[PDB]
Write a protein that binds this ligand. Sequence first.
Ligand code: HEM
Ligand code: HEM
Ligand SMILES: N=C(NCCC[C@@H](NC(=O)[C@H](N)CCCCN)C(N)=O)NN(O)O
Ligand SMILES: N=C(NCCC[C@@H](NC(=O)[C@H](N)CCCCN)C(N)=O)NN(O)O
Ligand SMILES: C[C@H](O)[C@H](O)[C@H]1CNc2nc(N)[nH]c(=O)c2N1
Ligand SMILES: C[C@H](O)[C@H](O)[C@H]1CNc2nc(N)[nH]c(=O)c2N1
Ligand SMILES: OC[C@@H](O)[C@@H](O)[C@H](O)[C@H](O)CO
Ligand SMILES: OC[C@@H](O)[C@@H](O)[C@H](O)[C@H](O)CO
Ligand SMILES: [Zn+2]
Lengths: 407, 410
Amino acid sequence: RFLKVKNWETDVVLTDTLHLKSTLETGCTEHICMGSIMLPTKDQLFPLAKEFLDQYYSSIKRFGSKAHMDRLEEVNKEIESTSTYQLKDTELIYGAKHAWRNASRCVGRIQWSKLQVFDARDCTTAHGMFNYICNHVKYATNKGNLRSAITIFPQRTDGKHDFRVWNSQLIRYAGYKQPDGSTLGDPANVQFTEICIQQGWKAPRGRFDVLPLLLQANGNDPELFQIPPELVLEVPIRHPKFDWFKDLGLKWYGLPAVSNMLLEIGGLEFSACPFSGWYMGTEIGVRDYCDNSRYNILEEVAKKMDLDMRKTSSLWKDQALVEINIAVLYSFQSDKVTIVDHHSATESFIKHMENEYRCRGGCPADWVWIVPPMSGSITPVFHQEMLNYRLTPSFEYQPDPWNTHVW
Amino acid sequence: RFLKVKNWETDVVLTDTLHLKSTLETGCTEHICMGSIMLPVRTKDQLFPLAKEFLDQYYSSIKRFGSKAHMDRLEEVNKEIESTSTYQLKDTELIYGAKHAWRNASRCVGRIQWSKLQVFDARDCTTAHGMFNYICNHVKYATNKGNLRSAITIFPQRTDGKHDFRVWNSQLIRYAGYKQPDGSTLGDPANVQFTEICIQQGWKAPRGRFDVLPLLLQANGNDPELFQIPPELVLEVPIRHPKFDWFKDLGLKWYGLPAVSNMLLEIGGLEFSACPFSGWYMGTEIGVRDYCDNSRYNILEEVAKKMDLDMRKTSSLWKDQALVEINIAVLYSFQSDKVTIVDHHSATESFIKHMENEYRCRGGCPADWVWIVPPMSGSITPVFHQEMLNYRLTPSFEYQPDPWNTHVWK
Ligand code: HEM
Ligand code: HEM
Ligand SMILES: N=C(NCCC[C@@H](NC(=O)[C@H](N)CCCCN)C(N)=O)NN(O)O
Ligand SMILES: N=C(NCCC[C@@H](NC(=O)[C@H](N)CCCCN)C(N)=O)NN(O)O
Ligand SMILES: C[C@H](O)[C@H](O)[C@H]1CNc2nc(N)[nH]c(=O)c2N1
Ligand SMILES: C[C@H](O)[C@H](O)[C@H]1CNc2nc(N)[nH]c(=O)c2N1
Ligand SMILES: OC[C@@H](O)[C@@H](O)[C@H](O)[C@H](O)CO
Ligand SMILES: OC[C@@H](O)[C@@H](O)[C@H](O)[C@H](O)CO
Ligand SMILES: [Zn+2]
């Protein structure tokens, strides 16, 4: 059926036909919606490869061409002979750009076509992976003028020689459990922070310690590496009015770079494919800094602001939240590091949706993730109905390595 | 089949079995999620089964399942249906049904209060004046001088679909909206269409920014009639700010009693098309949506100007700043006038406790995450981190088309 999506603020209505090309299951059923659940063979492969190649040739205006047909047969024969196949560079670039295009949970997709793709399929060792990652970090950081990029390591073969970056992001802060029963640093990485130690790393036991990379190549055990500090751009956080803010001793890194997802293109699985763009302010100020299970700084900040924390109804958390988020944005802009606020990012996404609907017939989007975690309804995406469905190429979550690695 | 729900802040996982009793569709498929889509005469045949399901639920709830009273009631209802094509609920069943329609409302964050609902039986009502009297009584009881009490008034159920009782207003109390020839809007833009109908029906509009609308009541399928709610029954709160003495000069105020009046209540297959209900406000409904939605009063700029915030660039988060103060103002004003209200931190915290209690005593709690999470400060409220399962259980409150679009005029 042809579904329609309405924005309840502008009344603009869009019709979605793209969803009619979805194949994978959503997790929901006619009886129960699971929209808020965080994570709901040669025979198998050729169909997948065919679906992919078809859309590629269609995108280059050569659908049904001999070239299209020729390639189809070559891959076909390749799979029949090798049980797998290799992607042409052009297909690789198109696939990664489209996996981002299809990421229903990403609000910054208006930038999808500008992705710099780094082919690391010729990599063979962890040191090799370290080199490639360093190069990615430097390229993307670009002295503060961030540029989107993805580095793609060798695809899965028999699942016993998988390339994996054990970190969750190329750059993250360590977390340590202390006597107080309390947590020092970032609670979200406590387990990884330990595995590095359990593997040799010498933790500075600080509040913002850049974690080391733990890289795995060809199934072998992972190895540690310290990203050259000169390559990790960090931003000290200060407020444009509260001089005491700096005394909080807060800082964040300028490069957001998911490193543990799985990229699927034409049935091929790329288990190590770190990518990066740049931050939307709220990611840091709202979630990293204020989540109860993260740096949880609202109470300290509220205290330094001297407001009545006695009654929830004084909205002191809300007041403080805004200030913390003003300071994150201020600092990044001051140090000339790329960053986007939730208002501009959501406005761009709405623009992107319109482009997509008219040029592609739709845009899968996950409302639950697209709406910023603060000031939801004053951003336009809150008022925008969205259809969530799965299209490939795609980025998917995958088991953490330490729960599957056979040392 | 068991379904797990996890809270990503506490790691607490809950198990849902209640969804098994869900019969109605969600709008979603195994291929597409419509979780953020705002809205994606029965026959003797599909009536008794619906009645039976309900009565079994009712009798089981009172620990009398399988009793002779239970079996007699089922036989009594089947006969009434066969004989009259419909059936009347006992008072005890109507009350039970009403409370559960609220209990099953997946978009409602205030459900911890469901068992405390005052049900007014208006099934003997036959005219619009009768409806007015009933509604007036509801407003005075519910308002209770500012100490709000949840209530619902239930008018005659649908019979042939030609004699429906309807409250044409969206809420019993709402402010008028007027589209000006220059294209601007006076009052609440949300009610412009309904306001025009009222004017066309004879209402003499004061043409102000906060004019309480008249009630447009339809009894027995007859054309609607206008009534003015006694002013002394309409409690309103002037909005001022604890620290900004200029806030009061913004000339803002809101009514204290939120009373949805256009939903359809379904109990045992019976359809009650006029069932106004009311509880009390969560601050953000007024302070975030009614005041700051671009399509509503949209006061963000005027507030931001007075606070003299840098409005040159969004990254100064001037909108977010103005938003908090305005919301602070709404809560401060209601509390100072002793009119019941609840803030989003308090309300969401209670909903989590209620939700956990429901899983333990009922096996589930259908909830719509999209609606449950507050329109501001989303992730600093616990519901943001709470996984939820959305499905439909009956008794239920459902949307129904606006009456002016279906009504056959006499
Ligand atoms: C240009 C800057 C970009 C912005 C501002 C942006 C912003 C966002 C935000 C706000 C999230 C939510 C993060 C969270 O809550 O954990 C997100 C998620 C995501 N984005 Fe983007 N993004 C950008 C670039 C990228 C790039 C380059 C890709 C891939 C090539 C991408 C792929 C995705 C994916 C897969 C997710 C979901 C991740 C998850 O489920 O944890 N993003 N993006
Ligand atoms: C005790 C006070 C209560 C509080 C604080 C509360 C709060 C809310 C809020 C915040 C919403 C969302 C409203 C919106 O965004 O438009 C909601 C939805 C809803 N509530 Fe409650 N509620 C309460 C009592 C009730 C009562 C008494 C009933 C029914 C007997 C009820 C039925 C519903 C329903 C059916 C919805 C969905 C409305 C729609 O879809 O437009 N609530 N409630
Ligand atoms: N600006 C961004 N943002 C994307 C950040 C994604 C975030 N996800 C998370 O933290 C999920 N909760 C991890 C859950 C995975 C389940 N295994 C992470 N890995 O830190 N991207 N750019 O590249 O620009
Ligand atoms: N505190 C509350 N809050 C519930 C308020 C519901 C609100 N919904 C709306 O305004 C939707 N946009 C209407 C969508 C209907 C589409 N037909 C309304 N009609 O005023 N309840 N009580 O305390 O009782
Ligand atoms: C339970 C719920 O799905 C969970 O808390 C989601 C909500 N929305 C989110 N949205 C974004 N962008 N990122 C997140 O991590 C989440 N967490
Ligand atoms: C398009 C989207 O579904 C829509 O804007 C929803 C989002 N969440 C909401 N949540 C509540 N409580 N009330 C609303 O009116 C809405 N509107
Ligand atoms: O400390 C380890 C965690 O960061 C890790 O288990 C993540 O939860 C996982 O990689 C998904 O993000
Ligand atoms: O002005 C008429 C509107 O208020 C009306 O159409 C409502 O949106 C509808 O009754 C749902 O609340
Ligand atoms: Zn769904």
